[PDB]
Amino acid sequence: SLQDPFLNALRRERVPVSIWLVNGIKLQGQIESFDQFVILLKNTVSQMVYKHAISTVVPSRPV
Amino acid sequence: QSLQDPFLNALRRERVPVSIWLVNGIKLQGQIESFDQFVILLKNTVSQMVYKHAISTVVPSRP
Amino acid sequence: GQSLQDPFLNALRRERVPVSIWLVNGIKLQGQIESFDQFVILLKNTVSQMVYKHAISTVVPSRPV
Amino acid sequence: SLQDPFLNALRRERVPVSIWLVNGIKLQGQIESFDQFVILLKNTVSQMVYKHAISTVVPSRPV
Amino acid sequence: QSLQDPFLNALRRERVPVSIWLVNGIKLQGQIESFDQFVILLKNTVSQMVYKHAISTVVPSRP
Amino acid sequence: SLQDPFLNALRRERVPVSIWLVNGIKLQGQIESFDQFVILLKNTVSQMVYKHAISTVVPSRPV
């Protein structure tokens, strides 16, 4: 798995990401947590995003 | 299972109202009655069955 | 895993409750649940049509069961 | 499996069906053949349809 | 297995031009070079990898 | 099976790719790495792309 170190680094370092969804909508926030199926995106509000609904995870700055 | 399950369980036991957004953009509302590997039973006017595969985000109305 | 789908659909079926089945594309199907398996739901209306679970967003009863 | 007898009888009896796609498009034709993942829709032209792209299979007449 | 494989193989061996419609409505064109459980390699000006999960229909330019 | 040699060939040769998403948005960059579920695409930043959201991976130069 490359997924787990990619997300885990962005979570340890508290990097602001943009999570684009498969319908077009972008979301922005810090990655509070994740597991095999979902990512907890902690923003103004902490929301759970299903990976199946995600197209790409983009760090706002080069880490 | 180690983020998704306790997130959805905390919501279910505390009976917190949630916004469940589908991938097609619609926003369902209500309280989580129960959930398994595939579906979430969401209760409001009736108990409706929502397939996880059709959900983008789950948004708790309080932390 | 199965625990919940089968009892939920069976309750509607046995009680012949009219359901709205919403598709992920926003189209809404209507009718009675005639049967189901792991992947499909047969929805009886003017005809018995086969609906793929993968294309279903929500199953919504018409009356509070 | 309920799927196999449903499709098999529409094929044996050569019933014209109106398959539906998860994007909106409807296809019409007879079911020439199928397996676990695809259905062969025989029309003016034969085309293989992936089930994952199908929402519903609707017979044009009550069989 | 038994419909999808020999269909995509007869297309590959006979080098028949096909139309691969995606679920988003785009029509890719070209010849099947190879395929496994998940992807189809479609050759035209280059060889592009098309994920089956994103395909609605495969339409051969001849029977 | 075919994915790996395809992506590895693009990666090793550092061939720029267009990755089309199922929503029709096109991403661009180099392939850094990939696992069973994701492709790390390096452009201005290293972004993680979910395979489930990809329709087609397209090279810019014929291999």
Curated annotation (Swiss-Prot), chains A, D, F:
Coiled coil: none annotated. It comes from the Bacteria. Forms condensates in vivo, both in the absence and presence of stress, which differ in their material state. Hfq condensation has no impact on transcription but seems important for the roles of Hfq as an mRNA chaperone at the post-transcriptional level. Hfq condensation also appears important for its role as an sRNA stabilizer. It is found in: Cytoplasm. Its main location: cytoplasm. The keyword Secreted does not apply. Residues 4-63 form the Sm domain. The keyword Cell division does not apply. Disruption phenotype: Deletion of hfq seems to lead to a significant translational fidelity problem. Deletion increases persister cell formation. Deletion abolishes the antitoxin activity of sRNA antitoxin RalA, preventing it from neutralizing toxin RalR. One of its GO terms (biological process) is regulation of DNA-templated transcription. GO terms for molecular function: ATP binding; bent DNA binding; DNA binding; RNA binding; RNA folding chaperone; tRNA binding. Changing Q3A: No effect on Hfq condensate formation in both growing and late stationary phases. Keywords: Cytoplasm, DNA-binding, RNA-binding, Stress response. RNA chaperone that binds small regulatory RNA (sRNAs) and mRNAs to facilitate mRNA translational regulation in response to envelope stress, environmental stress and changes in metabolite concentrations. Involved in the regulation of stress responses mediated by the sigma factors RpoS, sigma-E and sigma-32. Binds with high specificity to tRNAs. Binds sRNA antitoxin RalA. In vitro, stimulates synthesis of long tails by poly(A) polymerase I. Required for RNA phage Qbeta replication. Belongs to the Hfq family. This is RNA-binding protein Hfq. The lineage of its organism: Bacteria, Pseudomonadati, Pseudomonadota, Gammaproteobacteria, Enterobacterales. The chain holds residues 6 to 68 of 102 of the full protein.
